[PDB]
Amino acid sequence: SMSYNYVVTAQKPTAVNGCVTGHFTSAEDLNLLIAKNTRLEIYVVTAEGLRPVKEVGMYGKIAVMELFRPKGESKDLLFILTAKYNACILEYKQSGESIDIITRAHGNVQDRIGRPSETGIIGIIDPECRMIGLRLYDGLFKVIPLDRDNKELKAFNIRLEELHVIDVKFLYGCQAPTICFVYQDPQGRHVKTYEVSLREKEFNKGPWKQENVEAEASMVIAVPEPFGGAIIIGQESITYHNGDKYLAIAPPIIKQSTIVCHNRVDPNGSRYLLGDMEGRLFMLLLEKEEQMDGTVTLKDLRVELLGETSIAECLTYLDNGVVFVGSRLGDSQLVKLNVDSNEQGSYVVAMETFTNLGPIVDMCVVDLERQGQGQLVTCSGAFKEGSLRIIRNGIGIHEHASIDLPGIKGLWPLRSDPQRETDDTLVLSFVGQTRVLMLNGEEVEETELMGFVDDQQTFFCGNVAHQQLIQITSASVRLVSQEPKALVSEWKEPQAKNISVASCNSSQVVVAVGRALYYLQIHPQELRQISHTEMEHEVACLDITPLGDSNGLSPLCAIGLWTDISARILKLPSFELLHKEMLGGEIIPRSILMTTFESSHYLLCALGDGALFYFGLNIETGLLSDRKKVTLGTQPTVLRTFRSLSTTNVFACSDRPTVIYSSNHKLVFSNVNLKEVNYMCPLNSDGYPDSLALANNSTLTIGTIDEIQKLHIRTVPLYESPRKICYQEVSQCFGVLSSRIEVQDTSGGTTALRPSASTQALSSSVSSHETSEEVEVHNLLIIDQHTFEVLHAHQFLQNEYALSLVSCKLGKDPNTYFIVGTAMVYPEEAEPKQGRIVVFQYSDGKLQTVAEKEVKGAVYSMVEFNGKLLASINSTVRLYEWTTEKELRTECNHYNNIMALYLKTKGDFILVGDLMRSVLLLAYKPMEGNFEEIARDFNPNWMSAVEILDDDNFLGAENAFNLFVCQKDSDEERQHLQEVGLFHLGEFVNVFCHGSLVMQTPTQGSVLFGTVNGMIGLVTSLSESWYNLLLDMQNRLNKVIKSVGKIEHSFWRSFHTERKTEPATGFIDGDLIESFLDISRPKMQEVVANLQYDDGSGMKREATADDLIKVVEELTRIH
Ligand SMILES: CCOc1cccc([C@@H]2CC(=O)Nc3c2c(C)nn3-c2ccc3nncn3n2)c1
């Protein structure tokens, strides 16, 4: 069992798996809810756009997500079902700034027997909220009655005679709850209804008889009153049914591509949006026919093409012509629908684009810029959405000026013009001195500013009330008129003692002299002394940033003190103590700041040692709450607000410059990708708009900052599907396997749907579902590592699929090659019986074929192996040598596989991942020239990816979203690999690769993985003693953290396939561990009660809160 692993999220899933609108946060709000695997994102729809309210993680994959409103509820409730059959009903509760998702009802609805249906879990709710219906398995329909008594969500099953249901909905306008569904039997596809009897717990005959529908009828729409009835969407037809009523259309406009989603635009069902696999967006329009009895029937159906979106998993109309396009295969979007078409005749205009990395089908890590700074390059998306994505940690700065100028001690922007809205002045402090720089476009020049002194050190200067400037120095506070620039007022301490600390806003000043504080107000031509006090200790730092709807005025003074290392909130003008916090230690506070993020207020206080304490701040009572602490460096941190893209954030200067910001109403910290920064200020001038001034010991820089986020993503559109990637350092390029769909005609020809990377390369060579006829045409792309231009595309043979790709040298040949493994794909073949290995050389802008090898199967995987080429081909693993004639030649073979899909190697060891029989360990035996089977995992697993952790530890991912770790057994029972680690990840892993995105203690090793949902994860190793500590922490965390839907963490992480359910073992959930930094202090104290740790050999010692914070902080830095 001596494998201990830790798995943590580096990038949360980005794919959208579902989306609903309604009134969840309040009756009056319009909400958009988005499901991204295990995450629920809640937004309020505004004219501004989407306002984020709350993101809630759940301990499950979200399979069903629907809003509904029982009689007596003031706003919508939310029904969630997870993939592990956890059902819950949730309520949004907001009290002040505290947001809580409360569980109204919960229970697990898994049955002991059943076959999961082809078109998946379906969950539907009756319009009248009488019941929830679940299609979990073939032949069964599960009913959860919605009585107020049913808090355990007890359910009953009804036998469903139709075994193969495609889609199902509850109908509107029905006296009894009534389902309408499409099902398939040997006689074709059919639409049918049943009423659902709560009394009989059984179906009753439906209100209208069944009809035959199109062979590819796939979606049921329940149309609201006054239409009622159902619309059935197929590939070639749309039909409406309401009993003594049938209407069908066969509009040719839809036949080109499968329609995969729908959404109702109007409450009464007059219009619907439809989306297809080529991102076409249609409007479906229902024309009313009146009747004498006042009912409405359907006169006609029409479909109109509006334009193109991302390929939509889901569409949600948000009012006022705005649509959310939720994409699994490309970026999500907000689009606007216009009444009038544009130039090319589209009614659709993209408003906003949201990054989706998924699916990540392959990836690699390259130090693209600096040595030691790995970046992840993914094969992302599919079809027209396909892309490369380049992911890197930290926030970049774009330097636009650099001036040699040592000894800077402070920076302040100033508008010397009272008319101009932009800064035109940068003021610098030095020891004992001040200098003023004017900004004329890009020119930066020394200048004097009348009223300001140059022979004292400035602690603050800026624009202030009544069209005035202020300069606060060690000697005095100077107030200066704007026109002309004259000294209009000067404040000094009564005996002209030095000012030691300064804080200022537009209308208020607070200065310290040693222990003394003075509060001044800025009036026309007057610095007015209001009040003063003597602090118990010397003053270390001050802030009076006004917060909230305060009209630029602060009733509060934040202060840090020497000696007791206190952060205090004082009232102005009295200086009455509202709150005191002792921060501990013997290192003084250096920087203190009152701040607002996402409409919450905080106090930030940084010590000389790199520690940052932060608290919730009540701006009415002065109360500080829920202390947290991070570490931002080993030097003093200086804090300063700036604005980028209409949000205020805080820049933290230290040896590790950082931006502090908010996400999901919690503070976040992201590294800035710069060396040590001592000082900074925002600067918005004509020549340097929306910019930052930065200083170190020697230099002043002016630049702009990138988006404020943990990870930067660059996108390279390919407009076709990338499949595999490898890096070739000697060529300074990537090789990328890609495929594009073409459409075949009745003769000998196929045609592309659009230009894409493989059709738009600089040069090209050849060898000698998206649509509803289709063929995949595969290519090797050569892409420049700097410009990501497509330099060359090589096209493979007709019906040749490119499966594997490696860049390597072989044998005694100094050249580096791109090598590709393929399969010839024919329709009748269960698996391929033919493939090739092709060795290419990239020289002088083109790919040349150096050698080919015909093999009798699909070449699924290839790896460089000790100067030889290792390949898996159908059920065979084969080692090839590169001969003097530049030909591949078989050395040895292994045959004991079903389908050898995945290879990794380490030394002479080979890890083989099979379609259905898990993993196998081979050794190449150099003195025999053959393989030896060392051990295999005799537990069947349907593999998706493999990795070697070390000589003794083998990591697998399988199709049911689990990880496992195999080891050799601690006889020829040595032939049995032991599954010593098990963990339900809840993602589908396509790729593992050794590497790190962090610039290169508790953990060893770094394995990244990429998933279908665009999630990037990390696996690393732990010692026994570190594992035990972290397991104990998990157990304690799980007793204090309330889970949404009352799902147990242990249940969620349990290994779960069709053959085996077991508790997780040998795996720490780093996402859970990291949440230790987000819990309250009471909870934190609870976790730590009598918690001990082993030190590495025997001795057990107490684990303190503060030491555990440091532990978890270290852990966050591994990604
Ligand atoms: C990376 C930053 O970590 C630490 C930072 C500060 C203090 C500690 C304290 C003391 C210390 O030196 N060790 C320690 C601690 C705590 C809680 N756990 N812990 C273990 C646990 C398992 C283990 N296995 N080998 C060695 N250890 N040390 C840690």
Side-chain angles (χ1 to χ4, degrees), residues 1080-1084 1086-1089 1091-1096 1098 1102-1113:
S1080 66
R1081 285 192 82 189
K1083 274 160 152 40
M1084 284 176 168
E1086 286 186 61
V1087 168
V1088 160
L1091 174 51
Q1092 291 182 344
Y1093 71 88
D1094 185 298
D1095 65 2
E1102 160 176 298
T1104 70
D1106 298 318
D1107 281 8
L1108 283 187
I1109 284 167
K1110 280 163 183 179
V1111 164
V1112 179
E1113 277 195 289

Coordinates of all heavy atoms in Angstrom, one line a residue, residues 1080-1113, unseen atoms left out:
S1080 N -14.2 29.0 8.4 CA -14.2 29.9 9.5 C -13.2 29.5 10.6 O -12.8 28.3 10.6 CB -15.6 30.1 10.1 OG -16.0 28.9 10.7
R1081 N -12.8 30.4 11.5 CA -11.9 30.2 12.5 C -12.4 29.1 13.5 O -11.7 28.2 13.9 CB -11.5 31.4 13.3 CG -10.6 32.3 12.5 CD -10.0 33.4 13.4 NE -8.9 32.9 14.2 CZ -8.3 33.6 15.2 NH1 -8.9 34.7 15.7 NH2 -7.1 33.3 15.6
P1082 N -13.7 29.3 14.0 CA -14.3 28.2 14.8 C -14.1 26.8 14.2 O -13.6 25.9 14.9 CB -15.8 28.7 15.0 CG -15.7 30.2 14.8 CD -14.6 30.4 13.8
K1083 N -14.5 26.7 12.9 CA -14.4 25.5 12.2 C -12.9 25.0 12.2 O -12.6 23.8 12.4 CB -15.0 25.6 10.8 CG -16.5 25.4 10.8 CD -17.2 26.0 9.6 CE -18.5 25.3 9.2 NZ -19.3 24.8 10.3
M1084 N -12.0 26.0 11.9 CA -10.6 25.7 11.8 C -10.1 25.2 13.1 O -9.3 24.2 13.1 CB -9.8 27.0 11.4 CG -9.9 27.4 9.9 SD -9.1 28.9 9.5 CE -9.1 28.9 7.7
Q1085 N -10.5 25.8 14.2 CA -10.1 25.3 15.6 C -10.7 23.9 15.8 O -10.0 23.1 16.3 CB -10.5 26.4 16.6
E1086 N -11.9 23.7 15.3 CA -12.5 22.3 15.5 C -11.7 21.3 14.8 O -11.5 20.2 15.3 CB -13.9 22.2 14.9 CG -15.0 22.9 15.7 CD -16.4 22.6 15.1 OE1 -16.8 21.4 15.1 OE2 -17.1 23.5 14.7
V1087 N -11.2 21.6 13.6 CA -10.5 20.6 12.8 C -9.2 20.2 13.5 O -8.8 19.0 13.5 CB -10.2 21.2 11.4 CG1 -9.2 20.4 10.6 CG2 -11.5 21.4 10.6
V1088 N -8.6 21.1 14.2 CA -7.2 21.0 14.7 C -7.2 20.4 16.1 O -6.1 20.0 16.6 CB -6.6 22.4 14.7 CG1 -5.3 22.5 15.6 CG2 -6.2 22.8 13.2
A1089 N -8.3 20.1 16.7 CA -8.4 19.7 18.1 C -7.7 18.3 18.3 O -8.2 17.3 17.9 CB -9.9 19.6 18.6
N1090 N -6.5 18.4 19.0 CA -5.8 17.2 19.4 C -5.3 16.4 18.2 O -4.9 15.3 18.3 CB -6.6 16.3 20.3
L1091 N -5.3 17.1 17.0 CA -4.7 16.6 15.8 C -3.2 16.5 16.0 O -2.5 17.5 16.3 CB -5.1 17.5 14.6 CG -4.4 17.2 13.2 CD1 -4.5 15.7 12.8 CD2 -5.0 18.0 12.2
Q1092 N -2.6 15.4 15.7 CA -1.1 15.2 15.8 C -0.6 14.8 14.4 O -1.3 14.4 13.5 CB -0.8 14.1 16.8 CG -1.0 14.6 18.3 CD -0.6 13.5 19.3 OE1 -0.4 12.3 19.0 NE2 -0.6 14.0 20.5
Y1093 N 0.8 14.9 14.3 CA 1.4 14.5 13.0 C 2.7 13.7 13.4 O 3.3 13.9 14.5 CB 1.8 15.7 12.2 CG 3.0 16.6 12.7 CD1 4.3 16.3 12.4 CD2 2.7 17.7 13.4 CE1 5.3 17.0 12.9 CE2 3.8 18.5 13.9 CZ 5.1 18.2 13.6 OH 6.1 19.0 14.1
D1094 N 3.0 12.7 12.6 CA 4.3 12.0 12.6 C 5.3 12.8 11.8 O 5.0 13.3 10.8 CB 4.1 10.6 12.1 CG 5.4 9.7 12.3 OD1 6.4 10.1 11.7 OD2 5.3 8.7 13.0
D1095 N 6.5 12.8 12.4 CA 7.5 13.8 11.9 C 8.4 13.2 10.8 O 9.3 13.9 10.3 CB 8.4 14.3 13.1 CG 9.2 13.3 13.8 OD1 9.2 12.1 13.4 OD2 9.9 13.7 14.8
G1096 N 8.2 11.9 10.5 CA 9.1 11.2 9.6 C 9.6 9.9 10.1 O 10.1 9.0 9.3
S1097 N 9.6 9.7 11.4 CA 10.0 8.4 12.0 C 9.6 8.4 13.5 O 10.4 8.8 14.4 CB 11.5 8.2 11.9
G1098 N 8.3 8.1 13.7 CA 7.8 7.7 15.1 C 7.2 8.8 15.8 O 6.0 8.7 16.2
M1099 N 8.0 9.9 16.1 CA 7.6 10.9 17.1 C 6.3 11.7 16.7 O 6.3 12.2 15.6 CB 8.7 11.8 17.4
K1100 N 5.3 11.7 17.5 CA 4.1 12.4 17.3 C 4.1 13.7 18.0 O 4.5 13.8 19.2 CB 2.9 11.5 17.6 CG 2.7 10.2 16.8 CD 1.9 10.3 15.6
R1101 N 3.6 14.8 17.3 CA 3.6 16.1 17.9 C 2.3 16.8 17.5 O 1.6 16.4 16.5 CB 4.8 16.9 17.5
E1102 N 1.9 17.8 18.3 CA 0.7 18.6 18.1 C 0.8 19.4 16.8 O 1.9 19.9 16.4 CB 0.6 19.6 19.2 CG -0.3 20.8 18.9 CD -0.6 21.8 20.0 OE1 -1.2 21.3 21.0 OE2 -0.2 22.9 19.9
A1103 N -0.3 19.4 16.1 CA -0.5 20.2 14.8 C -1.3 21.5 15.1 O -2.5 21.4 15.4 CB -1.1 19.3 13.8
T1104 N -0.7 22.6 15.0 CA -1.3 23.9 15.3 C -2.0 24.4 14.1 O -1.7 24.1 13.0 CB -0.3 24.9 15.8 OG1 0.5 25.3 14.7 CG2 0.5 24.4 17.0
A1105 N -3.1 25.2 14.3 CA -3.8 25.9 13.3 C -2.8 26.6 12.3 O -2.8 26.4 11.1 CB -4.7 26.9 13.9
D1106 N -1.8 27.3 12.9 CA -1.0 28.2 12.1 C 0.0 27.4 11.3 O 0.4 27.8 10.2 CB -0.3 29.3 13.0 CG -1.2 30.2 13.7 OD1 -2.2 30.7 13.0 OD2 -1.0 30.5 14.9
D1107 N 0.5 26.2 11.8 CA 1.4 25.4 11.1 C 0.6 24.7 9.9 O 1.2 24.4 8.9 CB 2.1 24.4 12.0 CG 3.2 25.0 12.8 OD1 3.4 26.2 12.8 OD2 4.0 24.2 13.5
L1108 N -0.6 24.3 10.2 CA -1.5 23.7 9.1 C -1.8 24.7 8.0 O -1.8 24.3 6.9 CB -2.7 23.1 9.7 CG -2.6 21.8 10.5 CD1 -4.0 21.3 10.8 CD2 -1.9 20.7 9.8
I1109 N -2.0 25.9 8.4 CA -2.1 27.0 7.3 C -0.9 27.0 6.4 O -1.0 27.0 5.2 CB -2.4 28.4 8.0 CG1 -3.8 28.5 8.5 CG2 -2.0 29.5 7.0 CD1 -4.1 29.7 9.4
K1110 N 0.3 26.9 7.0 CA 1.5 26.9 6.3 C 1.6 25.7 5.4 O 2.1 25.8 4.3 CB 2.8 27.1 7.2 CG 3.0 28.5 7.6 CD 3.9 28.7 8.8 CE 4.0 30.2 9.2 NZ 4.9 30.3 10.3
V1111 N 1.2 24.5 5.9 CA 1.2 23.3 5.2 C 0.4 23.5 3.9 O 0.8 23.1 2.8 CB 0.8 22.1 6.0 CG1 0.4 20.9 5.1 CG2 1.8 21.7 7.0
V1112 N -0.9 24.0 4.1 CA -1.8 24.0 3.0 C -1.4 25.1 2.0 O -1.5 24.9 0.8 CB -3.3 24.2 3.5 CG1 -4.3 24.3 2.3 CG2 -3.7 23.2 4.5
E1113 N -0.8 26.2 2.5 CA -0.3 27.2 1.6 C 0.8 26.6 0.7 O 0.8 26.8 -0.5 CB 0.4 28.3 2.5 CG -0.6 29.3 2.9 CD 0.1 30.6 3.4 OE1 0.7 30.5 4.5 OE2 0.1 31.5 2.7

